[PDB]
Design a protein around this ligand. Structure first.
Ligand SMILES: [Zn+2]
Ligand SMILES: [Zn+2]
Lengths: 126, 550, 158, 182
């Protein structure tokens, strides 16, 4: 357990990048004598929120297409790469949305399109 | 050998690190017994030099050679151990001296045994096992250290000759190893920063020994004048600087902070090195150790790579070098060759050399004379480093090769101008260059060269000259419909090539052919193509360029 | 074009006469690298060509002559262009990983006859930069471990 | 299973051949212990001649191995190729394998199989060229099996020097009335 777990990052591609970069560069400083949190904190060089307010902080955390949380196990996880929208979605809702539109083009496991709310370039990897 | 080296490094680490119990003393007393008995051991314990003559015919000779190298390595490791034990005990240094005397005896035996056969084996020039950490220490202790607690006991080692040349040989072997692989042999020869640190410290040591104690202190013998320690340290310096430019280019500042930008540091270092070269030369030695002078100019070429061609110190370098080219005669081919190489390399990153090529060609034309043995020309005033034995076999080749480089550059320009159709100044600079090369060839073709490489290279370069003229007149055939007319400067260029060059070209063809395969047919092919395309150009340019031709 | 680029640049830099005359045009090397930065976003169709290109550079101008100006600098820089490319891409295009990686390894394992120094150097840079991205492409390593028995010694340690 | 794998640390460098022999004698006897035997025997010191015999000895019994192991055996078979024996052993293999009998259970193991092949041909060139010849040269029999397509595809998918060669072969195959819908 103390050994490094498989970990990766959801959210804004412009926000996620410095976390992956900083992890990659400092990961050698990971040490399996400490705890997972006590390692992660000096590895990723950031802190966590301890129950900021976990039921309602200040965000309509619903899908903003389906306007629900908990569609069939799935969580709002796919977000915009934008400061002004930051609107979460579901994989399913945002997929069905982008697969409709004429602008969208599909590479191998990726679809690029326009965020419904702000019409900025948003990526979905199935 | 290698086992003991590892052991003693491990135990030194165990002392320095592990203690800050009753185990290491075992190994200590084992080593001390080996020391004391290996002192009073000599060569008939291992039945060496006497019973088997190490022959590379028999098995037993192989046994004795392998054994001797094992012994030599053991000797060295206990040298390291005995040094590592104490703070500079006299008795242990006597033991080290005795060990070294054993080792050096074995070395002079093996040298005889590689004197019977050739030195095809790289087994006596095999690695020492001493850490580079160690060798840095050893040379610091020998030269720089003057602490009286150590001085009394080190003064016996200082009193050596053979020992001191051995010490610098070791460092040189580490350096050669570092050049050829990525890294050196012994312990911590795999972390680059540690190797770098030892590099910097070696560099400081050899600089100090060269600068403080001069070379003109040879009070050993007239056999040691090609083997002076003041020579070996500078040789090391050279290899270090090459190696560190090659491997550790992104650390030269922290490399130099051992010895503010690169310019002032390098300028101050150059001044001292070049003063050293001046005093060696200005000594006016008739014996003339050319080895030290060659190495000095070599190191100056190596160092001059870190002066920017825009710096005033760069121009100071170039002026100084040209001054050396203008003063000091120094009758040895390799000095002139290395120096001219330096001069050109510095010069061209400041300006085109075709003036200097012409002036050097003028010097060439002075000393040799002419084909007709009735042109008395001497222009020795220009450059002092031009002699009967230097400029005739040697300088011609370099000055013509540089001219070839000039022709390649202007060829690239001609190519770009043909492809292009930014117009006028390009061709103006091109024709300026080509005019000066044409005067250059006017001086070269007049000379009487020896029948070696000189004549065929001169003919080949004149073929390149006609090819360049062909490309030029081809570009003028290309361009002359759009603009309409020829610039006056092209008319002057083609006038000078018709009038000056081609007649003496013919005379030189006659001179080379009379004195007794492909280049001369190639030359006449080039000249006839030039005439044909010039006919084409003179018709299609509305300018009569055949009245200047004959 | 890239060879020509480098021949040009070498000739220029050795030579002030040309530096006076010619205005410093960007070199194709630089353009490609800049392509790669712009590439980052959404340019899968360019990157998949990039990789092929770079490996063509490496394959062609890996060393051979030990088994000088002309053979070294516009070959060394070609190969290490390859490498620069593929590293820069491997930072940012997270779906052409395991295909750089697998292609590297493909040139690692079997050859051992052509000098392959550059490939391990590349691989070292690649991995050091983010090893966490190879616990997403891990199987590709463990099948070269089955060939680790058969490899010359300098290769294996390095 | 445990004691066998521990064999090579125990025995000296002398009494190997008879063990090899005795083990080969067990190998024809029992199929359950193909893998560990082959593991050991690749590790012990044998005559090349004995190896070749064991190669043929395993390959006749190739149908008989329970699925799980089949992969690792081929690993053995395909490390144990010279340049020169390539085409006989390949032809035999190409003949003897089925893909018909085997079939989550079947498919996973097959996938691993094809991985092993993919690996093999990636990491050693000659297997590729020989292998296609072993389909091209067996133009005769109309009865070609699931395998041959799959393998041609795979090799097209990997090393690309061969693509033209595959294309020509596939045309000659189609016009010839070998290769067809079903
Ligand atoms: Zn939803
Ligand atoms: Zn948005």
């Amino acid at each position: 357990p103390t050994m490094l777990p498989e970990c990766f990052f959801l959210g804004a591609d412009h926000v996620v990048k410095p976390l992956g970069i900083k992890l990659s560069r400092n990961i050698h400083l990971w040490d399996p004598e400490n705890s997972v949190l006590q390692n992660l904190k000096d590895v990723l060089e950031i802190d966590f929120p301890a129950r900021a307010i976990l039921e309602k902080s200040d965000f309509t955390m619903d899908c903003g297409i389906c306007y629900a949380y908990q569609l069939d196990g799935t969580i709002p996880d796919q977000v915009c790469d934008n400061s002004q929208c930051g609107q979460p979605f579901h994989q399913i809702c945002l997929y069905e949305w982008l697969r409709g539109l004429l602008t969208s083009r599909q590479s191998f496991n990726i679809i690029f399109g326009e965020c419904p709310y702000c019409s900025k370039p948003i990526t979905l990897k199935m | 050998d290698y086992l003991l080296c590892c052991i003693q490094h491990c135990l030194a680490w165990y002392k320095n690190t592990v203690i800050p119990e009753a185990f290491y003393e075992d190994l200590d007393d084992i080593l001390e017994s080996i020391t004391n008995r290996m002192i009073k051991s000599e060569l008939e314990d291992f039945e060496l030099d006497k019973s088997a003559d190490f022959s590379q015919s028999t098995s037993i000779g192989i046994k004795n050679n392998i054994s001797a190298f094992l012994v030599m390595g053991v000797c060295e490791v206990l040298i390291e151990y005995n040094f590592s034990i104490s703070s500079f005990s006299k008795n242990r240094f006597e033991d080290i001296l005795s060990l070294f005397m054993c080792y050096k005896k074995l070395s002079d035996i093996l040298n005889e045994k590689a004197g019977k056969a050739k030195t095809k084996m790289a087994n006596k020039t095999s690695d020492s096992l001493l850490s580079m950490k160690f060798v840095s220490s050893l040379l610091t202790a020998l030269f720089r250290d003057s602490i009286q607690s150590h001085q009394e006991s080190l003064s016996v080692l200082r009193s050596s000759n053979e020992f001191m040349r051995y010490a610098v040989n070791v460092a040189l072997q580490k350096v050669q190893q570092l050049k050829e692989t990525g890294h050196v042999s012994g312990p911590d020869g795999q972390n680059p920063e540690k190797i770098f640190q030892n590099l910097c410290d070696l560099t400081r040591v050899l600089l100090w020994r060269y600068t403080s104690i001069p070379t003109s202190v040879e009070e050993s013998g007239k056999k040691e004048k090609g083997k002076s320690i003041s020579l070996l340290c500078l040789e090391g310096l050279q290899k270090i600087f090459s190696a560190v430019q090659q491997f550790y280019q992104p650390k030269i500042q922290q490399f130099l902070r051992a010895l503010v930008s690169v310019t002032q540091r390098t300028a101050f270092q150059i001044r001292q090195f070049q003063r050293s070269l001046l005093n060696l030369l200005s000594s006016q030695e008739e014996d003339f150790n050319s080895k030290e002078a060659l190495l000095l100019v070599t190191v100056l070429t190596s160092l001059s790579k870190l002066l920017e061609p825009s710096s005033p110190q760069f121009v100071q370098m170039l002026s100084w070098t040209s001054k050396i080219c203008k003063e000091n005669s120094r009758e040895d081919a390799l000095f002139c060759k290395s120096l001219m190489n330096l001069l050109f390399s510095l010069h061209v990153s400041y300006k085109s050399p075709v003036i200097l090529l012409r002036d050097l060609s003028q010097d060439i034309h002075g000393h040799l004379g002419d084909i007709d043995q009735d042109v008395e020309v001497e222009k020795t005033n220009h450059f002092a480093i031009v002699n009967l034995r230097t400029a005739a076999p040697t300088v011609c080749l370099l000055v013509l090769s540089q001219a070839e480089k000039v022709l390649e550059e202007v060829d690239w320009l001609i190519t770009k101008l043909k492809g292009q159709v930014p117009n006028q100044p390009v061709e103006k600079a091109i024709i300026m260059q080509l005019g000066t090369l044409l005067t250059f060839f006017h001086e070269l073709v007049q000379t009487a060269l020896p029948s070696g490489s000189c004549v065929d290279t001169l003919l080949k370069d004149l073929c390149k000259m006609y090819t360049t003229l062909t490309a030029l007149v081809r570009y003028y055939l290309q361009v002359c419909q759009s603009s309409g007319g020829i610039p006056k400067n092209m008319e002057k260029l083609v006038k000078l090539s018709g009038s000056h060059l081609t007649p003496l070209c013919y005379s030189f063809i006659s001179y080379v052919q009379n004195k007794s395969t492909k280049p001369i047919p190639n030359l006449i092919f080039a000249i006839e193509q030039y005439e044909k395309f010039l006919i084409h150009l003179s018709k299609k340019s509305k300018v009569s360029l055949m009245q200047h031709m004959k | 074009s890239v060879v020509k680029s480098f021949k040009d640049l070498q000739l220029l830099q050795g030579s002030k006469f040309l530096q006076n005359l010619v205005p410093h045009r960007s070199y194709v090397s630089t353009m490609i690298l800049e392509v790669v930065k712009n590439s980052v976003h959404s340019w899968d169709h360019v990157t998949q060509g990039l990789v092929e290109l770079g490996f063509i550079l490496m394959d062609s101008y890996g060393p051979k002559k030990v088994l000088p100006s002309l053979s070294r600098m516009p070959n060394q820089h070609a190969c290490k262009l390859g490498a620069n490319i593929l590293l820069e891409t491997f930072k940012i295009h997270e779906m052409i990983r395991q295909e750089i990686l697998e292609q590297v390894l493909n040139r690692v394992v079997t050859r051992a006859s052509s000098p392959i120094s550059h490939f391990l150097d590349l691989l070292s840079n690649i991995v050091m930069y983010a090893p966490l991205v190879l616990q997403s492409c891990s199987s590709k390593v463990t099948e070269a471990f089955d060939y680790l028995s058969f490899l010359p010694l300098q290769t294996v340690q390095r | 299973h445990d004691i066998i794998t521990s064999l090579p640390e125990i025995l000296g460098d002398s009494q190997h051949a008879d063990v090899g022999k005795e083990l080969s004698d067990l190998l024809i006897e029992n199929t359950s212990l193909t893998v560990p035997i082959l593991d050991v025997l690749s590790s012990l010191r044998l005559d090349p001649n004995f190896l070749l015999k064991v190669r043929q000895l395993v390959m006749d019994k190739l149908s008989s191995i329970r699925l799980e192991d089949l992969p690792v055996i081929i690993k053995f078979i395909l490390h144990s190729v010279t340049a020169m024996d390539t085409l006989e052993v390949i032809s035999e293999l190409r003949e003897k394998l089925d893909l018909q009998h085997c079939v989550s259970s079947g498919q996973s193991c097959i996938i691993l199989l094809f991985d092993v092949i993919k690996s093999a041909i990636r990491y050693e060139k000659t297997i590729s060229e020989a292998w296609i010849k072993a389909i091209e040269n067996t133009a005769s029999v109309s009865e070609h099996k699931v395998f041959d397509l799959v393998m041609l595809f795979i090799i097209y998918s990997t090393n690309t020097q061969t693509k033209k060669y595959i294309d020509r072969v596939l045309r000659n195959k189609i016009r010839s009335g070998c290769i067809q819908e079903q």
